[PDB]
Amino acid sequence: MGSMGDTRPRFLWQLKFECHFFNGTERVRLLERCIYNQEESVRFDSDVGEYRAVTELGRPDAEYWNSQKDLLEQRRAAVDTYCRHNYGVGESFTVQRRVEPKVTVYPSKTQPLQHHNLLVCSVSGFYPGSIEVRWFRNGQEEKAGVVSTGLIQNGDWTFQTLVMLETVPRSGEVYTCQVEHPSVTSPLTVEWRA
Amino acid sequence: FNCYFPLQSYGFQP
Amino acid sequence: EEHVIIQAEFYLNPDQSGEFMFDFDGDEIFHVDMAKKETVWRLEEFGRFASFEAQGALANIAVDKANLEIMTKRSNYTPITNVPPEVTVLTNSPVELREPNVLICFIDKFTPPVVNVTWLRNGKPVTTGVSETVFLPREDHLFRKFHYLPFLPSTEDVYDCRVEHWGLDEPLLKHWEFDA
């Protein structure tokens, strides 16, 4: 029983230095976090300016590090020497990265409802994550019957989403999957003519 | 060079 | 504008496994290979645009190891509680017969960062052209991971991503077949 061997207990220590950016680099917040197992125990927050204990386990470390004035000076300036530095290192291929979605429309292999056509809009390969995928019937946005997978991260600097619509396809009806995404100034559209 | 800089981890009190 | 860059590290005992990586809005910029002692860029072109001195990561890892030992003793040897993963299998894009595609095994919401992943083709382990990411950080301090299998879609092959983890009593087995 157990899906893998070597069940000795484990002990885990994580350190995270988070640089949070608002309006470009107009505002910056550095958050250093120390986590033992699954419990954060002490942090430095640049909006605070000193180490603080999150749990009891972290109290000696806050006390020790707050006694080190060089260290506090260094951390207090890291919003500049670290966050804004690293922001500028990578801005052109991270912040500025724009990869256009590929959009395809097709009938589901599953057609559960007689006289209905279940349609699928596949939106893939795009960057960054912010996107809107919507269905239109003729000139009207469909506000009912739509189902979305929401945003899916692929782990490789691309995303995808899948949006389905049950249609009662009449003659002369045109169904359009329409995508708004920061990589394009005009929406992407792919149409299905019933 | 165009260099990412790390923040250095510091030890607990010994 | 809203963006977050995270330098995330860890050390795990008794495995003696370290990790150091940078994350931008949830995607990995790079990590350091602790065996080769070298920077590994998540996309190849990143290494043409930027640099990172791997010895800084290795020095941080030594300190992380020392701090883990202290914290292990300080907590009276309180071990991590296993949190088993959630596993989803999807493809990179809509699947068409005989059009190369990629199967993604997404492993989420687990700790500690040790997990075993096997791709099975028609029930048999397959190694051809697989790749994987390091452990990726989550705000709840659990982890995420991706495994990839390029494949040529057919009606005759089925696939499973098999995931094992100390928090699972039995292997998770997540299936994919061509939607015929």
Residue numbers in the entry:
A (entry chain B): -3 to 190
B (entry chain C): 1 to 14
C (entry chain A): 3 to 182
Task: Reproduce the article's own wording on this structure.
CD4+ T cells recognize a broad range of peptide epitopes of severe acute respiratory syndrome coronavirus 2 (SARS-CoV-2), which contribute to immune memory and limit COVID-19 disease. Analyzing six epitopes, some with very low binding affinity, we solve X-ray crystallographic structures of each bound to HLA-DR1. In summary, each peptide bound HLA-DR1 canonically in the “forward” orientation that is described for HLA-DR,48 excluding CLIP. We observed little deviation in the overall structure of HLA-DR1 irrespective of bound peptide, particularly within the peptide binding groove, where the solved diversity of bound peptides had little impact on the position of the HLA-DR1 residues that lined each pocket.
S486–505 bound HLA-DR1 at low affinity (IC50 = 3,046 nM). The refolded complex was crystallized and diffracted to a resolution of 1.8 Å. HLA-DR1-S486–505 was solved in space group P 21 21 2 containing a single copy in the asymmetric unit. HLA-DR1 bound S486–505 via the register FNCYFPLQSYGFQPTNGVGY (core residues underlined). Binding in this register satisfied 3/4 anchor residue preferences for HLA-DR1, incorporating the favored P1-Tyr, P4-Leu, and P6-Ser. Deviation from the motif ideals was observed at P9 by incorporation of P9-Phe, which prefers shorter aliphatic residues. Within the core, this register placed P2-Phe, P5-Gln, and P7-Tyr as potential contact points for TCR recognition. A free cysteine within the peptide did not negatively affect HLA-DR1-S486–505 refolding; however, a strong positive peak in the Fo-Fc map at the P−1-Cys side chain indicated additional density capping the reactive free thiol. A covalently conjugated cystamine, likely from reaction with cysteamine (a component of the refolding solution), modeled and refined well into this density. The cysteamine, however, did not affect peptide-HLA-DR complexation due to its outward-facing orientation.
